[PDB]
């Protein structure tokens, strides 16, 4: 009949007129009394409703609506192998997430999906149950209950159908494990469905590259024990027969470079048909075509076989394409470091033909810089002209500023501290700046350095360094070992090729030291300088000004800039005094770090570190003692202490030397002073040699999301320091420090983590081969 109005009881998801957008009644016509059914069908088919009830008890249309509830919270429990992070993404992908409506179809879909995943991994006695608890004001809560029963243990892998290879040899290389060694915990026996396909492909390639061509896998089964405990994987093969490569021929729209393709395609006659060799040939053809510009070549290799004479004649069809050009190079993610410090690392120049190798090499150079965590390349073709393409680099800038605060000693010295900051990427400008200063009742020290890697746009890098160390024994400047030292350094370096650098520079430093303790090495140095001071009284003064010309070489082919995973680095630094300086000496230092990977994933890495060092004087003038090397602590032989490896000073009889307070300053003073006495104070020699071997392994309590920020290493470490000059007479009753065979050694574990304060290393070190005056330490924390 006639309807006056339309009234509803659904108020949340239904709009004002969006409801009426579907009904045909229009409140302005007589009702057929049957089309109401069609109206309800359409309304519920809109998908925004759950129950619809039309009433015309009076003279109007009342549509009782039961809107679908809006999910308000997500609870799930009993799951072990499916973590929340992936489950949330899986639920969100299928269009269910908190805040939107619920559809009963998606519930069944999610149950099926999760049960499918468990059947894939192996929890065959598993079933997720999703139940919705109603909540007032028409809401629901979704609950998931997981019966993760148990993974079935794969029992045996059978390769019946082989007649040239033993089963064990074949099943050794499979990613799945037949039997785990008894006395090992190397692996497991879970059946991952993807690993099955991986191993089937592995077997196919294995027979395919030892010669057998007419080889194929008939059928693979996955039996199951009638208890859902064991899985018996079976593979059937057609062994086939061996073959030889009769001759490989190339054809197609090959570009003008046919000579190099022919040279690549040459193979010594008589070889066995190898599939991986064919893939290698195709890949290198693609690379050689890419280097000239054809970045998208179609290469198809067909092994036409003659099964009557053990012969295959591979046909290689090549279609190069067009010489692509890069239209523009864009950078994304460099939110701090300005655009220049990316565009200057490139080797694929803008507005040129696409050199498919130059892009990858530029990506390598960007990665090596040391201040990008993840750098990824993406060559995407522009949707217009046939041959244009944009190379887009996506970077994620990482922290690159190292901080260092702390205290000189626990006793209340007073406003005495140590500070530090080193920025590799100061405000992203590219400059490397570093400043630190420690003031203490023992010493006062302050240094600064600024380096610009690209003073001009070729690589010519310019740097300067200043320092001030007039510590004068801040405890007291009277009758104390006083040393005011300072100088300046300026260097610049240029590259020779893509993996080298040479630096040269100048500097001058002067040292004024007064009231020195008497001991053998220092007095030898003073005798060399042309000084003949006394021993018991300590009032001598020495001022020396040195003008040093210094040089260095740097080879850096390293896959990453922050605990890398592959490559090599060598760093040589030397200095020579120029004529006219007070001291005539020369010093040479060499550093080397080599990272070799053993696994495709680049997670287990062998690290070989080594350092060598030799310094001496020229023209009968000894090398100054204050330039002596050291060892120990971190960054060297780790496990003893910083600067405690090598010679120990032998004090002359010290007595009545200016002021000697009682119960302090007891270096060698004694009323019954006998003779020279051995001590434990380290002075450093002029021959340095340290080596270290590290096994780098993943940390066993971390996910991949944080895997690149923590590194764990097991190190065996060795090192030794000794003096090139010696006295048989003055060291008759004391160990001969000139002998370089007294090698200190240690081993231990190291933890490395990159914190917002900078990189941190925690190490636990056990020494093995020690000597006197080591005071070895087991824990070492450093920044």
């Amino acid at each position: 009949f006639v309807v006056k109005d339309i009234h509803f009881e659904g108020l949340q998801r239904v709009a004002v007129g969006a409801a009426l957008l579907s009904m045909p009644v229009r409140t302005g016509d007589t009702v057929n009394d049957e089309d109401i059914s069609n109206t309800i069908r359409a309304l519920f088919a809109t998908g925004n409703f759950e129950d619809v009830c039309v009433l015309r008890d009076g003279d109007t249309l009342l549509v009782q609506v039961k809107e679908r509830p809006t999910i308000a919270s997500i609870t799930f429990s009993g799951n072990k192998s499916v973590k929340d992070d992936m489950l949330k993404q899986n639920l969100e992908a299928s269009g269910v997430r908190v805040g939107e409506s619920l559809d009963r179809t998606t519930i069944a879909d999610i149950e099926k999906g999760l049960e499918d995943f468990y059947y894939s991994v192996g929890k065959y006695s598993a079933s997720v149950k999703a139940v919705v608890t109603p909540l007032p004001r028409n809401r629901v809560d979704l609950k998931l209950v997981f019966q993760e029963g148990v993974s079935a243990e794969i029992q045996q892998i059978n390769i019946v159908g082989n007649h040239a290879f033993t089963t064990d040899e074949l099943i050794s290389h499979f990613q799945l494990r037949d039997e785990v060694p008894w006395w090992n915990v190397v692996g497991d026996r879970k059946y991952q469905k993807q690993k099955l396909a991986g191993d089937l492909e592995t077997l196919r390639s294995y027979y395919l590259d030892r010669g057998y061509a007419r080889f194929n896998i008939d059928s693979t089964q996955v039996s199951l024990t009638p208890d859902k405990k064991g899985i018996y994987v079976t593979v059937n093969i057609t062994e086939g027969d061996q073959y030889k490569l009769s001759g490989v021929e190339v054809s197609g729209n090959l570009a003008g470079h046919s000579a190099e393709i022919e040279q690549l395609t040459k193979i010594e006659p008589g070889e066995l048909y190898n599939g991986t060799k064919v893939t290698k040939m195709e890949d290198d053809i693609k690379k050689l075509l890419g280097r000239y510009g054809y970045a998208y070549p179609r290469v198809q290799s067909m092994p036409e076989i003659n099964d009557a004479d053990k012969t295959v004649k591979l046909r290689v069809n090549v279609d190069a394409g067009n010489r692509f050009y890069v239209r523009k190079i864009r950078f994304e993610g460099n939110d701090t470091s300005k655009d220049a410090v990316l565009r200057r690392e490139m080797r694929q120049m803008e507005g040129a033909w696409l050199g498919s190798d130059l892009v990858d090499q530029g990506k390598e150079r960007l990665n090596r810089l040391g201040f990008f965590e993840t750098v990824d390349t993406d060559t995407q073709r522009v949707p217009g002209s046939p041959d244009q393409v944009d190379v887009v680099y996506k970077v994620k800038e990482r922290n690159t500023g190292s901080f260092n605060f702390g205290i000189g000693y626990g006793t209340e010295s007073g406003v005495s501290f140590q500070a530090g900051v080193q920025q590799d990427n100061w405000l992203g400008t590219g400059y490397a700046v570093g400043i630190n200063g420690t003031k203490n009742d023992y010493q006062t020290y302050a240094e600064l350095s600024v380096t610009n890697p690209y003073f001009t746009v070729d690589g010519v890098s310019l740097g300067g360094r200043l320092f001030y160390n007039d510590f004068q024994a801040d405890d007291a400047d009277l009758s104390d070992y006083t040393n005011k030292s300072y100088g300046t350094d300026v260097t610049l370096g240029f590259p020779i090729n893509e993996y080298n650098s040479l630096r040269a520079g100048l500097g001058y430093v002067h040292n004024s030291l007064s009231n020195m303790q008497p001991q053998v090495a220092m007095w030898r140095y003073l005798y060399s300088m042309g000084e003949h001071p006394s021993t018991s009284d300590q009032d001598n003064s020495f001022k020396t000004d040195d003008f040093t010309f210094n040089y260095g070489w740097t080879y850096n082919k390293l896959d990453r800039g922050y605990f890398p995973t592959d490559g090599s680095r060598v760093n040589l630094t030397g200095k020579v005094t120029i004529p006219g300086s007070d001291n005539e000496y020369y010093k040479v230092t060499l550093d080397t770090a080599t990272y070799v990977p053993i696994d495709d994933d680049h997670k287990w890495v062998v690290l070989g570190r080594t350092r060598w060092g030799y310094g001496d004087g020229l023209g009968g003038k000894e090398m100054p003692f204050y330039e002596n090397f050291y060892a120990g602590g971190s960054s060297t032989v780790r496990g003893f202490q910083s600067n405690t490896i090598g010679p120990k000073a032998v004090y002359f009889p010290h007595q009545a030397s200016n002021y000697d307070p009682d119960y302090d300053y007891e270096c060698a003073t004694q009323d019954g002073a006998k003779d020279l006495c051995k001590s434990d104070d380290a002075v450093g020699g002029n021959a340095m040699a340290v080596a270290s071997l590290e096994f780098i392994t993943p940390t066993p309590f971390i996910s991949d999301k944080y895997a690149n920020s923590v590194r764990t290493s097991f190190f065996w470490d060795m090192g030794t320091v000794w003096d090139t000059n010696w006295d048989s007479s003055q060291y008759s009753g004391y160990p001969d420090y000139s002998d370089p065979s007294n090698i200190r050694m240690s081993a231990g574990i190291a933890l490395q983590w990159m914190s917002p304060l900078g990189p941190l290393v925690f190490s636990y070190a056990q020494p093995f081969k020690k000597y006197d005056g080591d005071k070895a330490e087991q824990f070492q924390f450093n920044i």
Binding site: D339, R344, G351, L427
Partner: protein, 218 residues
């Protein structure tokens, strides 16, 4: 984490905290009210309050997500222009985020993706609702954004001139003329293109650029 209370008082305490400004505490109350009362009488007000609180809390990703959520369910509303304005403000404020203001470093050649993402927003705003009360600020920020993008392209062109890749210089400056013609950066950049032609022995192509620079010297 909130006591169960009738709607009026929980909204009142949320607004009181917002008057105070403790956004870390106001967002909790707003989220609780919205989650408990999804499609109530005044869910729109809760959504807009979430936008304001998220923005002033420097919580840019969630503010962006809430803007992009609300832009759909209410395509027409007397405050949709406000939502677009805050979308643009979110993008642009997200761009200029670092310490470099303290030290005074001209952020011009950093990533421009945020700048363009904001320009699209403010263009939509000034094109759709030209009589609103936010339009003049949008216009000024549009001028600033165009100047900034032109400066970025100019920086790339200048580096390529220094490096020696001339064709890059020519293409970049031609693009700057094509897209950002009325700014001051492209006026600064014309001499680079003139030199790029001259160094390639293209007198018949550098003469015209010399004429243009001469004409617009003023």
């Amino acid at each position: 984490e909130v006591p169960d209370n009738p709607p009026n008082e929980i909204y009142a305490t949320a607004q009181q905290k917002l008057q105070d400004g403790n956004w870390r505490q106001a967002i909790t109350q707003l989220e609780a009210l919205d989650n408990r009362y999804p499609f109530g009488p005044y869910s729109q007000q809760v959504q807009l309050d979430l936008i304001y609180a998220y923005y002033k809390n420097a919580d840019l990703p969630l503010a962006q997500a809430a803007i992009d959520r609300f832009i759909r369910l209410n395509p027409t509303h007397p405050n949709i222009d406000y939502v677009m304005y805050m979308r643009g403000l979110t993008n642009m404020a997200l761009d200029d985020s670092a310490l470099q203001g303290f030290f005074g470093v001209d952020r011009s050649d950093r990533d421009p993706q945020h700048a363009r993402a904001a320009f699209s927003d403010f263009s939509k705003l000034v094109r759709g609702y030209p009589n609103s009360q936010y339009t003049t600020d949008a216009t000024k920020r549009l001028v600033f954004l165009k100047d900034r993008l032109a400066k970025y392209e100019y920086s790339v062109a200048e580096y390529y001139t220094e490096r020696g890749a001339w064709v890059a210089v020519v293409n970049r400056v031609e693009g700057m003329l094509r897209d950002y013609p009325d700014t001051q950066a492209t006026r600064d950049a014309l001499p680079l293109m003139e030199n790029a032609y001259r160094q390639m022995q293209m007198n018949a192509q550098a003469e015209k650029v010399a004429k243009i620079i001469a004409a617009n010297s003023s």
